[PDB]
């Protein structure tokens, strides 16, 4: 079973309001071999709570990281969107903070090592840390040195001893996946020199609330983060938030730079600005999260009836992409193989498998192109621009997409938008 949250990860208080509860839900990245039955499929409570002190949003429970990540088989996206964004991460880190060539960049949750590869092409020394054994072996094979472990205070000390002081420590979409964020902050503090930086990229709570991105709630995602809660945490570990960049990726994200409290790096005014913006948009008030809650109920209900209505008219519907978040979407909406006949997905490992809970089949794009699908529910909506850009033939044939946020809508729209 999953361990229950007592006190807050960031600020250490214990005072939260309930925001939404989806009950027991199977793990979003636990895809299944098809056929037979699925009686023993594990399910865990999926509910979110908001800490009234620092306003970290968090799941009620913490599924064991060993279970989640040790055989995590899914590689970093090889999409043009992510290739470009990884190049941008390098650019921002190097150019904004003046990291010279030959500097050392450590990455937490480095996966297959593609982000590090880009840092190596910019002339940097690198090292990865990722517990997915399979994936770490691929990175190591490719020539990108990766320790096959979770990040910790002791692994941090092993890195310092063997590899030295990093000019940059990077964690992309991994900081929200770690329960003991205090230990990370400690390992980081020990690692950083006077002008070293700790940069983390996470989905921005402001964007999640405003665009009603409830499908981004899943067990892997323990935290849902704003700038406020991070300052609260780093205060308690001799670390200080020095800069933030808002990004379009993954439905609205923040790339947060953190340095030693008593180090070289000055705090930029942007940090205060975003903290003021968070207050100004109701993040410290109960109503905001009750409003989120009904938006979810509204979107969930109108998404299912929209799907079931179209099916009743004799239209065929499939899912486009089989991302982790799509499995929250379809489980919460209670959709099944009768509603979506398959989900197409470019991930070879996923092809031939079946989705968690809903048990919808996952098929290949080459198969999908042989089927007369009228609507695709766009589950990988964070890649909307890239996806729509290569689906001209489908759209030209009168095919349509259903987007789940900010509100359910049909692409193409009825008129040209300027
Ligand atoms: C969703 S992925 C992020 C992959 C990559 N950073 C990206 O942005 O595409 C989460 C990755 O972090 C790894 N991970 C999870 N918990 C970790 C921890 N405590 N320390 C280091 N890596 C971790 C997982 O094995 C997985 O490869
Ligand atoms: C960009 C793109 C992604 N996909 C799929 C590949 C991935 O399995 C999924 C995107 O998942 P992603 O959001 O990158 O991560 P996660 O594995 O946590 O969901 O969508 C397509 O099928 N076609 C596409 O054009
Ligand atoms: Zn808190």
């Amino acid at each position: 079973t999953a361990r229950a949250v007592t006190t807050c990860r960031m600020c250490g208080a214990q005072d939260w309001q309930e925001v939404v509860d989806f009950g027991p839900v199977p793990l979003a990245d636990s895809f299944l071999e098809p056929a037979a039955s699925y009686d023993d499929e594990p399910r865990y409570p999926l509910a979110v709570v908001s800490c009234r002190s620092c306003r970290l949003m968090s799941l009620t429970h913490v599924v064991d990281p060993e279970v989640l990540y040790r055989t995590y088989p899914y590689t970093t996206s090889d999409s043009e969107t992510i290739k470009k964004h990884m190049g941008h991460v390098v650019a921002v880190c190097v150019e904004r903070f003046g990291i010279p060539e030959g500097s050392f960049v450590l990455e937490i949750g480095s996966n297959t090592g593609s982000q590090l590869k880009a840092f190596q092409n910019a002339g940097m020394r690198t090292l990865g840390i990722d517990p997915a054994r399979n994936i770490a072996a691929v990175a190591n094979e490719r020539g990108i040195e990766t320790l096959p472990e979770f990040f910790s205070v002791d692994t941090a000390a092993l890195v310092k001893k063997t590899h030295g002081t990093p000019q940059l420590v990077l964690g992309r979409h991994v900081f929200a996946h770690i329960d003991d964020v205090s230990a990370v902050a400690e390992g980081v503090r020990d690692l950083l020199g006077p002008d070293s930086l700790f940069a983390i990229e996470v989905p921005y709570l402001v964007d999640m609330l405003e665009r009603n991105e409830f499908d981004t709630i899943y067990h892997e995602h323990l935290s849902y983060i704003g700038v406020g809660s991070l300052v609260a945490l780093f205060r308690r570990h001799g670390l200080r938030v020095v800069d933030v960049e808002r990004l379009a990726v993954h439905g609205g994200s923040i790339l947060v730079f953190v340095g030693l409290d008593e180090g070289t790096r000055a705090t930029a005014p942007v940090v205060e600005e975003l903290i003021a913006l968070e207050k100004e948009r109701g993040l410290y008030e109960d109503a905001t999260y009750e409003r989120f809650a009904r938006h979810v109920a509204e979107i969930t209900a109108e998404l299912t009836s929209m799907v079931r209505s179209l099916r009743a008219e004799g239209k065929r519907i499939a899912g486009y992409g089989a991302p982790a978040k799509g499995n929250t979407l379809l489980n919460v909406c209670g959709l099944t193989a009768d509603d979506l006949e398959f989900c197409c997905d470019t991930t070879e490992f996923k092809q031939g498998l079946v989705l968690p809970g809903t048990h919808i089949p996952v098929r290949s794009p080459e198969y999908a192109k042989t089927q007369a699908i009228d609507y695709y529910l766009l589950l990988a909506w964070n890649y909307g621009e890239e996806i729509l850009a290569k689906e001209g033939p489908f759209l030209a044939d009168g095919g349509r997409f259903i987007l789940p946020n900010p509100r359910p809508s049909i692409v193409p729209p009825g008129e040209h938008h300027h």
Side-chain angles (χ1 to χ4, degrees), residues 260-314:
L260 289 168
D261 184 37
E262 32 64 43
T264 312
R265 303 286 182 186
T267 304
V270 191
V271 175
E272 184 184 28
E273 290 173 36
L274 255 37
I275 287 170
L277 179 135
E278 283 165 16
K279 286 201 183 79
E280 192 262 310
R281 278 161 183 287
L283 267 69
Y284 289 97
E285 312 195 56
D286 280 39
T288 302
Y289 300 91
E290 291 172 292
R291 192 207 314 160
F292 180 72
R294 67 176 180 80
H295 287 343
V296 173
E298 289 171 9
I299 291 163
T300 290
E302 74 159 304
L303 200 63
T304 57
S305 96
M306 182 167 53
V307 161
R308 270 152 195 177
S309 169
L310 287 163
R311 279 226 62 96
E313 296 174 14

Side-chain angles (χ1 to χ4, degrees), residues 38 42 82-83 88 98 107 109 126 137 150 153 161 176 235 249 259 295 305 313 319-320 336 338 353 370 372 383:
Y38 310 101
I82 295 308
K83 285 174 179 172
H88 177 247
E107 181 177 20
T126 61
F150 291 92
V153 170
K161 183 174 171 185
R235 265 199 194 100
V249 293
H295 287 343
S305 96
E313 296 174 14
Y320 196 113
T336 75
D338 301 324
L353 298 180
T370 74
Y383 301 118

Side-chain angles (χ1 to χ4, degrees), residues 152 168 175 211 259 265 319 351:
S152 67
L168 175 67
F175 199 73
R211 298 195 213 174
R265 303 286 182 186
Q351 289 162 20

Side-chain angles (χ1 to χ4, degrees), residues 28-29 31 72 74-82 177 218 220-221 250 320-326 343-347 350-351 363 365 379-384 386-388 390-391:
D29 277 320
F31 291 70
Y72 190 78
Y74 300 118
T75 67
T76 299
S77 168
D78 61 10
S79 59
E80 296 306 317
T81 312
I82 295 308
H177 297 57
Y218 50 96
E220 284 174 35
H221 293 166
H250 298 287
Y320 196 113
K325 65 173 127 314
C343 291
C344 63
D345 193 280
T346 49
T347 317
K350 294 181 178 182
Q351 289 162 20
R363 306 297 299 265
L379 301 169
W381 48 257
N382 52 314
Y383 301 118
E386 177 170 356
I387 287 173
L388 294 167
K390 74 185 171 181
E391 296 294 350

Side-chain angles (χ1 to χ4, degrees), residues 38-69:
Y38 310 101
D39 315 84
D40 54 336
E41 187 176 12
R43 305 174 85 91
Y44 304 82
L46 186 61
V48 270
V49 286
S50 175
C51 165
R52 289 196 175 83
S53 172
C54 76
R55 288 291 186 186
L56 165 71
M57 189 149 137
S58 164
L59 293 178
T60 56
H61 294 266
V62 175
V63 175
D64 179 22
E66 296 288 338
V67 174
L68 296 181
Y69 304 117

Side-chain angles (χ1 to χ4, degrees), residues 69 76 108-109 111 129-132 150-151 172-174 177-178:
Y69 304 117
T76 299
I108 301 169
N111 202 259
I129 311 289
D130 201 299
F150 291 92
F151 183 75
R172 289 196 60 255
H173 302 273
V174 67
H177 297 57
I178 305 162

Side-chain angles (χ1 to χ4, degrees), residues 323-342:
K325 65 173 127 314
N327 295 328
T328 290
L329 216 199
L330 301 170
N331 272 278
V332 172
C333 288
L335 304 181
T336 75
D338 301 324
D339 303 309
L340 309 190
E341 61 185 76
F342 61 83

